[PDB]
Structure 1
Amino acid sequence: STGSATTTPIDSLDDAYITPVQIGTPAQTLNLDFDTGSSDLWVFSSETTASEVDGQTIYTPSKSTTAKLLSGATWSISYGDGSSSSGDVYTDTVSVGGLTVTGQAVESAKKVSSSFTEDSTIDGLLGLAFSTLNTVSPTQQKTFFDNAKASLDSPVFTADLGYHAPGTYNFGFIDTTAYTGSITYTAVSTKQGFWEWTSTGYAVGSGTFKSTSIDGIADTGTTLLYLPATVVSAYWAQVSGAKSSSSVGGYVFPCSATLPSFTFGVGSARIVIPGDYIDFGPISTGSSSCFGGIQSSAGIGINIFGDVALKAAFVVFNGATTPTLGFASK
């Protein structure tokens, strides 16, 4: 089997991407944030505290003939940005882009934090990291991908995120028309439950490539590119007037600037992030200070290749017995 679904930016800045997912019988379609940095499939639901729902589409298990309470199971998750959610669990049929999993754990939110409530466009998350991070207790549950894997033509999924445009998540096949040149594969460590890999270095603009190992995670659920302070300082030093602002919460730059590109290494290959991808616009409406898309990972504890980086590439998440990650230009 295979699946193929379009993923669409939630706003004009590509802050996140939503992908329609069919849950239950008859289908209830919810727009979920596919997140390779976490491992829970959770949704706004008929059980979500009413005051914490503001425009989201909800899953109502009582209207699904295939829903079953997973008795005794609860879940609770906190993300790197401080947001959180929690609730109980149903199993139901879940389909993505024509690919169907029966008996998928669908985690029903009883509570969500303010940032979820305030984002009317995201109806929940679909985790695509390793199932060892799944938060369901007392019986940990498998991700959609892990459940689907045996049925897939090939045990892979791919992320092809657009810049200010829709893109695609495919399951079970590699679309050889979706990228240019060749795909370069690189080793993955699953020790922390993430798609964790080591970049071979970076360049700023037309500058020389610096060979240096940068361990980090391929994370579709994070907007920005978070890298060591040394790397980030070198980038922003090439932008007149750029500075790190503790009050704003990272690097800002004059909106009048033209940003340089940023290149990261994948083995001997190079992925170039155009400068415009690094512009996240005015810090507040009407401001001439703009927020940068490359930020320091100091204090996060891990480097994160978020959407800013991933949308510059066609990315293969290879879930074979020994997982690997592939990157191609496009």
Structure 2
Amino acid sequence: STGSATTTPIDSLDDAYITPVQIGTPAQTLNLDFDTGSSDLWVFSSETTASEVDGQTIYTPSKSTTAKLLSGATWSISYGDGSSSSGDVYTDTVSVGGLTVTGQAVESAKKVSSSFTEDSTIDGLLGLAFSTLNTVSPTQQKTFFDNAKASLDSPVFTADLGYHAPGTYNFGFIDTTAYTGSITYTAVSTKQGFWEWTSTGYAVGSGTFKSTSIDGIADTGTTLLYLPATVVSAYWAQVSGAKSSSSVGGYVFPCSATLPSFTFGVGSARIVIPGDYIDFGPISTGSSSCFGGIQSSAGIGINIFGDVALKAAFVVFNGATTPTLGFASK
């Protein structure tokens, strides 16, 4: 089997991407944030504290003839950005882009943090990291991809995120028309539950390439590109007037600037992030100071190849017995 679904930016900055997901019988369609950095499929629901729902579409399990309460199961997750959510668990039928899993754990939120309440466009998350990170207790549950994998034509999914435009998540096949050149595959460590890999270095604009190992994660659920302080300083030094602002929480730059590109290495291959992809707009409405899309990982503990990086590539999440990642230009 295969599935194919369009993923759409939630706003004009590409702050996140939502993908429609069918849950239950009859189907209830929710727009979920596909997150290769976590492993829970959770949704706003009829159980979510009313004051914490502000425009999201909810899953109502009592209206699904295939929903079953998973007895005694609860979940609670805290994300790297400080967001969180928790609740109880159903199993139900879940379909993405024509690919169906029966008996998928659907984690129904009773509580969500304010950042989720305030994002009316995100109805929940669909985790695509390794199932060792799933938070359901006392019996850990599998991700949608792990449940689908054996049925798929090939045990893979691909992320093709757009810049200011829709893109695609495919399951079970590699669309050879969606990229240019070849796909370069690179080793993955699953020891932390992430799609963790080692970039071979970087360049800023037309500058020479610096060969240096950068361990980090491929994370579709993180907006920005978080890299070591040395790398990020080298980037922003090429932008007149850019500075790290403690009050704003990262590098900012004059909105009148034209930003240089940023290149990262995948083996001997090179993925070029155009400068415009690094512009996250005014720090507050009407400001002429703009927020940068490349930020230091120093306070995070891991480097993160988030959407800024991934949307410059066609990315293969290869779930073979030994997982690997593939990157192609597009």
Secondary structure, in 3 states, of the residue corresponding to 1:190? coil
**Match in the other structure for 1:182:** 182
Q: What do residues 36-55 of structure 1 show as CA deviations (whole Å, max 9, x unaligned)? A: 00000000000000000000
Partner of 1:54: 54
Alpha-carbon separation, structure 1, partners of 2:47 and 2:299: 35
Question: 2: distance between equivalents of 1:191 and 1:231?
Answer: 25
Secondary structure class of the residue paired with 1:18: strand
How far 1:105 sits from its partner (Å)? 0.1
In structure 1, distance between residues paired with 2:308 and 2:113: 25
Distance, in Å, in 2 between the alignment partners of 1:151 and 1:234 is 46
Aligned positions, number: 330
Find the aligned partners of 1:325 and 1:268 in 2 and give their Cα distance: 14
User: Which residues of 2 match residues 1-330 of structure 1 at below 5 A?
Assistant: 1-330=1-330
Write the distance in 2 (CA, Å) between the matches of 1:207 and 1:299: 27
When normalised by structure 1's length, the TM-score is 1.00
Deviations 1:50-102 (A, max 9, x none): 00000000000000000000000000000011000000000000000000000
Q: What are the superposed Cα offsets for residues 184-224 of structure 1, whole Å, 9 maximum, x if unpaired? A: 00000000000000000000000000000000000000000
> 1:13-46: per-residue Cα shift (whole Å, max 9, x none)?
0000000000000000000000000000000000
Deviation at 1:136? 0.1
Residue 62 of structure 2 aligns to a residue whose secondary structure is helix
- Give a deviation string over 1:148-188, Cα, whole Å, max 9, x none: 00000000000000000000000000000000000000000
Distance (Å, rounded) in 2 between the aligned partners of 1:238 and 1:31: 38
Structure 1: distance between partners of 2:26 and 2:6: 21
Q: Report deviation, 1:232.
A: 0.1
For residues 187 and 18 of structure 1, what CA distance do their matches in structure 2 show? 28
C-alpha separation in 1, matches of 2:244 and 2:329: 30
The whole-number CA distance in structure 2 between the counterparts of 1:136 and 1:189 is 23
- Once residues 36 and 166 of structure 1 are traced to their aligned partners in structure 2, the CA distance between those partners, rounded to angstroms, is 18
Provide the rounded CA distance (Å) in 2 between the counterparts of 1:94 and 1:289. 43
Give unpaired runs (5+ residues) of structure 2: none
Could you report, residue by residue, the CA deviation over 1:132-161 in whole angstroms, capped at 9, with x for unpaired residues? Answer: 000000000000000000000000000000
- Deviation for aligned residue 1:299: 1.2
Give the SS at the match of 1:151: coil
Give the whole-Å Cα distance in 2 for the aligned partners of 1:273 and 1:306.
12
Distance 2:213 2:323 in 1: 19
Q: For structure 1, which runs of at least 5 residues remain unmatched after alignment?
A: none
Distance 1:260 1:59 in 2: 43
Cα separation, 1, equivalents of 2:225 and 2:299: 14
CA distance in 1, matches of 2:21, 2:256: 40
Task: List structure 1 runs of 4+ shifted beyond 3 angstroms.
Answer: none
C-alpha offsets along residues 249-283 of structure 1, whole Å, 9 cap, x if unaligned? 00000001010000000000000000000000000
Q: Residue 198 of structure 2: SS of its match in structure 1?
A: strand
The alpha carbon displacement at 1:306 in A equals 0.1
The separation in 2 between residues aligned to 1:286 and 1:105, in whole angstroms, is 44
Q: Deviations over 1:97-129 (max 9, x none)?
A: 000000000000000000000010000000000
> Take 2:299 and 2:190, find their aligned partners in 1: how far apart are those partners?
22
SS at match of 2:150: helix
